[PDB]
Amino acid sequence: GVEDEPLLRENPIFPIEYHDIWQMYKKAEASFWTAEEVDLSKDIQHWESLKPEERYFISHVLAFFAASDGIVNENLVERFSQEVQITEARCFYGFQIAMENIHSEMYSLLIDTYIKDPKEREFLMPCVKKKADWALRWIGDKEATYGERVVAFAAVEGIFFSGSFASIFWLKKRGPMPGLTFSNELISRDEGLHCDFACLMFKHLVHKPSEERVREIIINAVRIEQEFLTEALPVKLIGMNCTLMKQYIEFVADRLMLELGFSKVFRVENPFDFM
Amino acid sequence: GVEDEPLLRENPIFPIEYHDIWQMYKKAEASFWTAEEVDLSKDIQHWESLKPEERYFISHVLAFFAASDGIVNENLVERFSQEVQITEARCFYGFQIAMENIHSEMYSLLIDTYIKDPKEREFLMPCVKKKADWALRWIGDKEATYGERVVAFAAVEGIFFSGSFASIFWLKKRGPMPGLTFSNELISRDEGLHCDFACLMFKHLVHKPSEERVREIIINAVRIEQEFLTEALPVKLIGMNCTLMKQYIEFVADRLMLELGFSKVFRVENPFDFM
Ligand SMILES: [Fe+3]
Ligand SMILES: [Fe+3]
C-alpha cells in the first residue's frame, strides 16, 4: 500500500516541503569531519601502557565496527535511498553514506595503527556475526516492509553500537587515548543523529508495524547486543560490570521506543553517569 | 561480458587495491564545501546594476543548472554506484552525490536570491530540454554499456556545463558578483574532478566502446551545447562572441578526448585566456 505513503510515492528543489527533515540534513552537514582531523600520533604511547586484556578487547571492538558500518551502508545504497522518493530525505541519506564511509575509514586507520602485522588483522569471526541473521536478513528480505526495515536500522545504529560506544567512553576517563576517544565522540554523535533520523522517518510513515512487531525487533536487538558484551567479549576485560552494561543497553533500547513514539519496555535507569 | 571487468565484477577496507581512485576521493573530500560558506549578501547591489539582457541570461543559466545536477545525481544513485562494485570507486561516487546535492542547493539559494517572485521562477522549458533525448536516455537505456554510459556523463559534467562556467567567469572580470562567481569557481572545480574521475574509470575498463562510438557521444554532446549557447540563449546577451564560444566548447571536447586516451577531433585552440 505504497501509493498512500507521502514518504515513498513518486513525485515532482528549494521549495522546502519537509522542514523537519531538512533541518537534520543541515545538522548532519554542519557536523562534517574527515579521518585526518583525528590525530592518532599520541596514541601508541598509551596503547603500549595498556594491559593485554584491554588490547584483545579494544582490537576486537574496532573489528566489530569494521564488519558493521559496511552493512549499514549496503542497506542505504541498494534499498533505503532508492525507495524514499522525497527530496530532503535523499540529501540526508546521501550525506549519511558519505559519513558511513569516513567512519569505516577511521576504524581502519585505528586498526592499522594499533596492529602493524596483517596476520593479526585476520580474524575478519563466529564471535561477531550473531547479528547477520537479524541484520543482513533485513537487507535480504523482500517481504520486510519499509516500516519494519526503518525500525531495524534504527536498532543497528542505536542499540548495536551503544555498548561499544559506552566502552570507549569508559576507557576515556581511565585514562586518555585521544585517537580512540576523539573518533568515538564524533562517531557516536553521527550514529545518534542517524538513529534520530530513522525515528523521524518512522514518524512520517502512515503505515507502520504494530507495537508488538516494533517491540520484537528492539527486544531481540538488545538481547543480541547484551550477548556480545557480556559473553562473546565481556566488558569485564576492561574492568566493567556486566550487569550494569546489560542495563545500559536496555536504557538505550527504551529511549529508542519513546522516540519511535511507543512505551518503555524495560523501565531501567541509566547506570553510567558519563553517558 | 561483465565477469572480466575488475571494475564491475563482485568481490570481498583499508587494504588499498586502487591507489589512483583513492587519491581522487581524498582530493574530492579535501575540497568539501557547503552553501553557507558562499556569502550572497553583497550581490543584489550588483544584480541591480546589471542590464536586463544580462538578467534574462544569468537567471536562465542558473535555471538550466537546476534541471542538470538532478539528472547527474539520478544516474549515480540508481545506476553507477550500484554497478561499480569496488571499494574506492564507491567512496568517490558517495562523496560525489553529496556534493551534487550541495551544488543543486547553491543554484537554488542563488535563484531564490535573484528572483523574489515565485511566478517568475516558473519556466521550469522547451528551451533547455534538448539534452533529455541524449542525456536522460543514457539513464533510461538498458542496452547502453557501462563504457558508453561513463563516457556519456563525462560529457554531461565536462562539455554540457563548460560554456555556462565560461559565461560566469566572463561576467566575473566585468565586473564582480561574488555569489555567482565564488560559487561558480567551486562548482566548476567539482565538475572537473568528477569529469576527471569519469575518465579514470574509463581507463580501468577492459571492454570499452570503439573510438567511433566515443567520438559520436562527444561530437553530438558538443553540438547540443553549441546550440544552447549560440541560439537558445546566445552568450551574445552578455556581450560575448558566439564563434569564440562554439570554439571553446570544442577545445574542452578535445581535452576530454585526449584524457579518455583518444585523438583530438576538432584541433581548435582555447579562445578564452581566462579559462
Ligand atoms: Fe550510522
Ligand atoms: Fe558533477
Side-chain angles (χ1 to χ4, degrees):
Chain A
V2 167
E3 46 150 25
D4 294 295
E5 288 298 333
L7 230 46
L8 308 191
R9 78 189 160 187
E10 292 180 28
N11 121 79
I13 60 65
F14 209 95
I16 297 302
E17 193 190 350
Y18 287 104
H19 298 104
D20 47 357
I21 315 316
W22 190 247
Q23 186 174 226
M24 291 216 56
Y25 163 52
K26 312 242 68 189
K27 174 58 185 199
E29 200 173 340
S31 28
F32 182 71
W33 66 274
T34 57
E36 301 85 341
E37 293 162 84
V38 171
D39 184 7
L40 311 197
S41 62
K42 307 199 63 155
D43 269 17
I44 194 154
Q45 185 184 44
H46 299 258
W47 168 266
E48 200 150 293
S49 81
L50 267 45
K51 257 131 71 181
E53 301 77 41
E54 296 180 317
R55 281 184 213 99
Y56 167 96
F57 179 87
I58 283 175
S59 68
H60 278 51
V61 144
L62 293 179
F64 153 79
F65 278 138
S68 271
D69 286 59
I71 314 181
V72 174
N73 200 254
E74 198 70 350
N75 178 44
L76 306 155
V77 167
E78 314 203 356
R79 282 287 252 167
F80 270 27
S81 44
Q82 307 310 320
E83 291 173 311
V84 171
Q85 303 222 257
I86 105 272
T87 330
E88 301 87 345
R90 276 188 175 233
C91 296
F92 184 94
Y93 282 148
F95 212 84
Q96 194 187 313
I97 288 154
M99 295 306 312
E100 311 289 15
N101 279 333
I102 293 161
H103 295 166
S104 202
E105 199 199 327
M106 198 56 271
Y107 290 125
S108 288
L109 271 342
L110 283 173
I111 295 159
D112 269 7
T113 309
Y114 301 154
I115 311 296
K116 304 301 185 186
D117 174 39
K119 228 309 177 177
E120 279 174 294
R121 297 202 186 93
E122 299 150 19
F123 17 94
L124 200 211
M125 264 169 55
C127 154
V128 59
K129 294 176 168 79
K130 309 306 192 201
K131 329 199 178 187
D133 259 314
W134 188 98
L136 286 151
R137 161 269 167 108
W138 265 301
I139 300 185
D141 214 50
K142 272 290 149 184
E143 313 132 3
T145 76
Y146 184 58
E148 286 168 325
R149 286 156 43 239
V150 186
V151 182
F153 275 74
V156 191
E157 295 168 47
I159 312 296
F160 275 163
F161 312 136
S162 67
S164 289
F165 297 141
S167 317
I168 305 330
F169 271 118
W170 164 256
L171 294 176
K172 161 179 169 60
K173 77 220 313 297
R174 82 78 143 296
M177 188 150 164
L180 210 79
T181 87
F182 188 46
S183 67
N184 192 86
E185 283 167 345
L186 294 155
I187 298 178
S188 88
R189 182 208 43 196
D190 288 14
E191 300 295 291
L193 183 106
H194 302 160
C195 178
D196 294 353
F197 185 81
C199 287
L200 189 20
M201 297 299 103
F202 196 70
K203 274 169 236 149
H204 271 278
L205 207 65
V206 189
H207 289 297
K208 49 195 78 162
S210 70
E211 182 152 50
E212 294 77 59
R213 212 68 142 73
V214 182
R215 283 170 63 96
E216 186 76 353
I217 291 150
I218 299 299
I219 290 168
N220 296 350
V222 168
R223 293 331 187 192
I224 291 169
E225 168 72 356
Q226 289 181 335
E227 168 164 40
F228 176 85
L229 289 188
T230 63
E231 287 138 66
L233 205 255
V235 295
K236 201 197 157 303
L237 291 156
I238 64 170
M240 290 176 65
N241 188 295
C242 282
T243 301
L244 292 215
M245 184 64 263
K246 287 212 197 61
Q247 194 187 300
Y248 178 70
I249 295 312
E250 294 181 358
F251 170 66
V252 156
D254 275 355
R255 200 186 53 206
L256 174 54
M257 294 293 294
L258 282 171
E259 187 141 300
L260 302 175
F262 292 123
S263 282
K264 294 219 174 115
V265 0
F266 296 106
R267 312 206 94 85
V268 292
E269 299 277 274
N270 182 11
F272 299 137
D273 29 44
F274 45 97
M275 303 295 312
Chain B
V2 167
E3 46 150 25
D4 294 295
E5 288 298 333
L7 230 46
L8 308 191
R9 78 189 160 187
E10 292 180 28
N11 121 79
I13 60 65
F14 209 95
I16 297 302
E17 193 190 350
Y18 287 104
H19 298 104
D20 47 357
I21 315 316
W22 190 247
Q23 186 174 226
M24 291 216 56
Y25 163 52
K26 312 242 68 189
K27 174 58 185 199
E29 200 173 340
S31 28
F32 182 71
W33 66 274
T34 57
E36 301 85 341
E37 293 162 84
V38 171
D39 184 7
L40 311 197
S41 62
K42 307 199 63 155
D43 269 17
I44 194 154
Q45 185 184 44
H46 299 258
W47 168 266
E48 200 150 293
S49 81
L50 267 45
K51 257 131 71 181
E53 301 77 41
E54 296 180 317
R55 281 184 213 99
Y56 167 96
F57 179 87
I58 283 175
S59 68
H60 278 51
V61 144
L62 293 179
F64 153 79
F65 278 138
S68 271
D69 286 59
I71 314 181
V72 174
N73 200 254
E74 198 70 350
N75 178 44
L76 306 155
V77 167
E78 314 203 356
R79 282 287 252 167
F80 270 27
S81 44
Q82 307 310 320
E83 291 173 311
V84 171
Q85 303 222 257
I86 105 272
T87 330
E88 301 87 345
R90 276 188 175 233
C91 296
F92 184 94
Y93 282 148
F95 212 84
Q96 194 187 313
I97 288 154
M99 295 306 312
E100 311 289 15
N101 279 333
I102 293 161
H103 295 166
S104 202
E105 199 199 327
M106 198 56 271
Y107 290 125
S108 288
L109 271 342
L110 283 173
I111 295 159
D112 269 7
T113 309
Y114 301 154
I115 311 296
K116 304 301 185 186
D117 174 39
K119 228 309 177 177
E120 279 174 294
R121 297 202 186 93
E122 299 150 19
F123 17 94
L124 200 211
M125 264 169 55
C127 154
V128 59
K129 294 176 168 79
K130 309 306 192 201
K131 329 199 178 187
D133 259 314
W134 188 98
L136 286 151
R137 161 269 167 108
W138 265 301
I139 300 185
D141 214 50
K142 272 290 149 184
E143 313 132 3
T145 76
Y146 184 58
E148 286 168 325
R149 286 156 43 239
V150 186
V151 182
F153 275 74
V156 191
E157 295 168 47
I159 312 296
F160 275 163
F161 312 136
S162 67
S164 289
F165 297 141
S167 317
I168 305 330
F169 271 118
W170 164 256
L171 294 176
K172 161 179 169 60
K173 77 220 313 297
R174 82 78 143 296
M177 188 150 164
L180 210 79
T181 87
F182 188 46
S183 67
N184 192 86
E185 283 167 345
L186 294 155
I187 298 178
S188 88
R189 182 208 43 196
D190 288 14
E191 300 295 291
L193 183 106
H194 302 160
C195 178
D196 294 353
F197 185 81
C199 287
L200 189 20
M201 297 299 103
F202 196 70
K203 274 169 236 149
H204 271 278
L205 207 65
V206 189
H207 289 297
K208 49 195 78 162
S210 70
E211 182 152 50
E212 294 77 59
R213 212 68 142 73
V214 182
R215 283 170 63 96
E216 186 76 353
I217 291 150
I218 299 299
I219 290 168
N220 296 350
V222 168
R223 293 331 187 192
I224 291 169
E225 168 72 356
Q226 289 181 335
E227 168 164 40
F228 176 85
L229 289 188
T230 63
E231 287 138 66
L233 205 255
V235 295
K236 201 197 157 303
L237 291 156
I238 64 170
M240 290 176 65
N241 188 295
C242 282
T243 301
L244 292 215
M245 184 64 263
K246 287 212 197 61
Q247 194 187 300
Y248 178 70
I249 295 312
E250 294 181 358
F251 170 66
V252 156
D254 275 355
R255 200 186 53 206
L256 174 54
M257 294 293 294
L258 282 171
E259 187 141 300
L260 302 175
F262 292 123
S263 282
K264 294 219 174 115
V265 0
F266 296 106
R267 312 206 94 85
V268 292
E269 299 277 274
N270 182 11
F272 299 137
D273 29 44
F274 45 97
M275 303 295 312

mmCIF file of all heavy atoms in Angstrom, chain A residues 176-196:
data_model
loop_
_atom_site.group_PDB
_atom_site.id
_atom_site.type_symbol
_atom_site.label_atom_id
_atom_site.label_comp_id
_atom_site.label_asym_id
_atom_site.label_seq_id
_atom_site.Cartn_x
_atom_site.Cartn_y
_atom_site.Cartn_z
ATOM 1 N N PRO A 176 43.165 8.696 29.101
ATOM 2 C CA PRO A 176 43.022 9.068 27.684
ATOM 3 C C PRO A 176 43.564 8.082 26.641
ATOM 4 O O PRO A 176 44.392 7.209 26.946
ATOM 5 C CB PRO A 176 43.795 10.398 27.579
ATOM 6 C CG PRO A 176 44.618 10.489 28.834
ATOM 7 C CD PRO A 176 43.829 9.764 29.874
ATOM 8 N N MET A 177 43.050 8.223 25.423
ATOM 9 C CA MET A 177 43.669 7.658 24.236
ATOM 10 C C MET A 177 43.088 8.440 23.053
ATOM 11 O O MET A 177 42.201 7.948 22.370
ATOM 12 C CB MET A 177 43.386 6.163 24.125
ATOM 13 C CG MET A 177 44.164 5.490 23.024
ATOM 14 S SD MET A 177 44.500 3.781 23.445
ATOM 15 C CE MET A 177 44.970 3.071 21.877
ATOM 16 N N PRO A 178 43.586 9.678 22.823
ATOM 17 C CA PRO A 178 42.797 10.661 22.049
ATOM 18 C C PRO A 178 42.306 10.184 20.676
ATOM 19 O O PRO A 178 41.244 10.608 20.226
ATOM 20 C CB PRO A 178 43.747 11.867 21.926
ATOM 21 C CG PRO A 178 44.750 11.698 23.041
ATOM 22 C CD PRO A 178 44.890 10.227 23.256
ATOM 23 N N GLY A 179 43.062 9.316 20.015
ATOM 24 C CA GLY A 179 42.608 8.746 18.764
ATOM 25 C C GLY A 179 41.280 8.066 18.986
ATOM 26 O O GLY A 179 40.261 8.541 18.510
ATOM 27 N N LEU A 180 41.299 6.973 19.746
ATOM 28 C CA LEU A 180 40.096 6.188 20.076
ATOM 29 C C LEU A 180 38.974 7.061 20.615
ATOM 30 O O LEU A 180 37.852 6.964 20.145
ATOM 31 C CB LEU A 180 40.415 5.083 21.088
ATOM 32 C CG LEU A 180 39.559 3.814 21.003
ATOM 33 C CD1 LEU A 180 40.046 2.941 19.886
ATOM 34 C CD2 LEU A 180 39.582 3.028 22.302
ATOM 35 N N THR A 181 39.276 7.940 21.568
ATOM 36 C CA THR A 181 38.225 8.679 22.287
ATOM 37 C C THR A 181 37.688 9.897 21.535
ATOM 38 O O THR A 181 36.526 10.245 21.723
ATOM 39 C CB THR A 181 38.634 9.076 23.762
ATOM 40 O OG1 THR A 181 39.334 10.326 23.784
ATOM 41 C CG2 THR A 181 39.476 7.963 24.440
ATOM 42 N N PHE A 182 38.508 10.540 20.697
ATOM 43 C CA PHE A 182 38.025 11.635 19.837
ATOM 44 C C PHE A 182 37.240 11.117 18.640
ATOM 45 O O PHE A 182 36.233 11.715 18.252
ATOM 46 C CB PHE A 182 39.177 12.512 19.336
ATOM 47 C CG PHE A 182 38.728 13.769 18.603
ATOM 48 C CD1 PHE A 182 37.712 14.581 19.112
ATOM 49 C CD2 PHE A 182 39.346 14.151 17.412
ATOM 50 C CE1 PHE A 182 37.312 15.732 18.446
ATOM 51 C CE2 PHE A 182 38.950 15.317 16.735
ATOM 52 C CZ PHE A 182 37.929 16.103 17.255
ATOM 53 N N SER A 183 37.706 10.023 18.034
ATOM 54 C CA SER A 183 36.956 9.398 16.964
ATOM 55 C C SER A 183 35.575 9.009 17.516
ATOM 56 O O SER A 183 34.542 9.495 17.049
ATOM 57 C CB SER A 183 37.710 8.189 16.397
ATOM 58 O OG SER A 183 37.812 7.143 17.335
ATOM 59 N N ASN A 184 35.590 8.171 18.551
ATOM 60 C CA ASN A 184 34.383 7.706 19.242
ATOM 61 C C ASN A 184 33.375 8.811 19.585
ATOM 62 O O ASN A 184 32.175 8.624 19.475
ATOM 63 C CB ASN A 184 34.795 7.007 20.523
ATOM 64 C CG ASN A 184 33.677 6.265 21.151
ATOM 65 O OD1 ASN A 184 33.435 5.124 20.809
ATOM 66 N ND2 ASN A 184 33.006 6.886 22.108
ATOM 67 N N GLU A 185 33.853 9.961 20.020
ATOM 68 C CA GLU A 185 32.937 11.056 20.283
ATOM 69 C C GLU A 185 32.246 11.444 18.985
ATOM 70 O O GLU A 185 31.010 11.524 18.934
ATOM 71 C CB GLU A 185 33.655 12.254 20.920
ATOM 72 C CG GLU A 185 33.941 12.036 22.425
ATOM 73 C CD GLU A 185 34.918 13.047 23.051
ATOM 74 O OE1 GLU A 185 35.629 13.785 22.319
ATOM 75 O OE2 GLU A 185 34.976 13.086 24.302
ATOM 76 N N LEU A 186 33.035 11.660 17.931
ATOM 77 C CA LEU A 186 32.468 12.068 16.651
ATOM 78 C C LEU A 186 31.558 10.963 16.090
ATOM 79 O O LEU A 186 30.423 11.244 15.695
ATOM 80 C CB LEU A 186 33.570 12.456 15.647
ATOM 81 C CG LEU A 186 34.408 13.703 15.974
ATOM 82 C CD1 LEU A 186 35.802 13.647 15.288
ATOM 83 C CD2 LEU A 186 33.638 15.001 15.619
ATOM 84 N N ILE A 187 32.039 9.718 16.091
ATOM 85 C CA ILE A 187 31.274 8.614 15.516
ATOM 86 C C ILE A 187 29.967 8.318 16.269
ATOM 87 O O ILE A 187 28.955 8.032 15.630
ATOM 88 C CB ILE A 187 32.111 7.307 15.350
ATOM 89 C CG1 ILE A 187 33.289 7.529 14.373
ATOM 90 C CG2 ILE A 187 31.234 6.199 14.853
ATOM 91 C CD1 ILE A 187 34.199 6.319 14.167
ATOM 92 N N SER A 188 29.978 8.410 17.605
ATOM 93 C CA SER A 188 28.764 8.184 18.414
ATOM 94 C C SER A 188 27.759 9.328 18.270
ATOM 95 O O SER A 188 26.565 9.108 18.399
ATOM 96 C CB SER A 188 29.078 7.953 19.890
ATOM 97 O OG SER A 188 29.141 9.178 20.596
ATOM 98 N N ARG A 189 28.233 10.540 18.003
ATOM 99 C CA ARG A 189 27.329 11.643 17.688
ATOM 100 C C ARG A 189 26.677 11.402 16.321
ATOM 101 O O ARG A 189 25.460 11.549 16.189
ATOM 102 C CB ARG A 189 28.074 12.970 17.705
ATOM 103 C CG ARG A 189 27.206 14.198 17.436
ATOM 104 C CD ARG A 189 28.001 15.352 16.791
ATOM 105 N NE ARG A 189 28.885 14.822 15.746
ATOM 106 C CZ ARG A 189 29.915 15.462 15.200
ATOM 107 N NH1 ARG A 189 30.207 16.715 15.543
ATOM 108 N NH2 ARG A 189 30.654 14.828 14.282
ATOM 109 N N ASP A 190 27.458 10.999 15.317
ATOM 110 C CA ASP A 190 26.890 10.717 13.998
ATOM 111 C C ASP A 190 25.794 9.649 14.089
ATOM 112 O O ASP A 190 24.692 9.833 13.565
ATOM 113 C CB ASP A 190 27.971 10.252 13.013
ATOM 114 C CG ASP A 190 28.917 11.370 12.580
ATOM 115 O OD1 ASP A 190 28.951 12.455 13.202
ATOM 116 O OD2 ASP A 190 29.653 11.144 11.612
ATOM 117 N N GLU A 191 26.091 8.544 14.774
ATOM 118 C CA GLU A 191 25.114 7.438 14.914
ATOM 119 C C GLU A 191 23.834 7.832 15.670
ATOM 120 O O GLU A 191 22.777 7.265 15.440
ATOM 121 C CB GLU A 191 25.752 6.212 15.569
ATOM 122 C CG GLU A 191 26.932 5.632 14.788
ATOM 123 C CD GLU A 191 26.525 5.073 13.447
ATOM 124 O OE1 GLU A 191 25.834 4.037 13.455
ATOM 125 O OE2 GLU A 191 26.886 5.655 12.395
ATOM 126 N N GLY A 192 23.930 8.824 16.548
ATOM 127 C CA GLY A 192 22.771 9.301 17.275
ATOM 128 C C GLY A 192 21.859 10.038 16.338
ATOM 129 O O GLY A 192 20.667 9.815 16.321
ATOM 130 N N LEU A 193 22.442 10.927 15.548
ATOM 131 C CA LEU A 193 21.715 11.674 14.532
ATOM 132 C C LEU A 193 21.147 10.733 13.437
ATOM 133 O O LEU A 193 20.008 10.892 12.999
ATOM 134 C CB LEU A 193 22.648 12.730 13.947
ATOM 135 C CG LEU A 193 22.045 13.660 12.908
ATOM 136 C CD1 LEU A 193 21.806 15.043 13.495
ATOM 137 C CD2 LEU A 193 22.987 13.714 11.740
ATOM 138 N N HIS A 194 21.912 9.734 13.005
ATOM 139 C CA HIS A 194 21.354 8.779 12.045
ATOM 140 C C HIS A 194 20.209 8.062 12.699
ATOM 141 O O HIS A 194 19.145 7.932 12.107
ATOM 142 C CB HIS A 194 22.368 7.764 11.560
ATOM 143 C CG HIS A 194 23.581 8.373 10.919
ATOM 144 N ND1 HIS A 194 24.769 7.691 10.786
ATOM 145 C CD2 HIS A 194 23.798 9.606 10.404
ATOM 146 C CE1 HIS A 194 25.661 8.469 10.203
ATOM 147 N NE2 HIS A 194 25.097 9.639 9.964
ATOM 148 N N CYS A 195 20.407 7.626 13.939
ATOM 149 C CA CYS A 195 19.344 6.963 14.670
ATOM 150 C C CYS A 195 18.134 7.865 14.900
ATOM 151 O O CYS A 195 17.007 7.422 14.735
ATOM 152 C CB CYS A 195 19.849 6.408 15.990
ATOM 153 S SG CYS A 195 18.518 5.628 16.922
ATOM 154 N N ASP A 196 18.351 9.130 15.248
ATOM 155 C CA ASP A 196 17.244 10.096 15.326
ATOM 156 C C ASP A 196 16.517 10.239 13.992
ATOM 157 O O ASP A 196 15.277 10.306 13.959
ATOM 158 C CB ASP A 196 17.722 11.466 15.763
ATOM 159 C CG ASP A 196 18.231 11.480 17.180
ATOM 160 O OD1 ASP A 196 18.110 10.462 17.896
ATOM 161 O OD2 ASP A 196 18.772 12.529 17.590
#
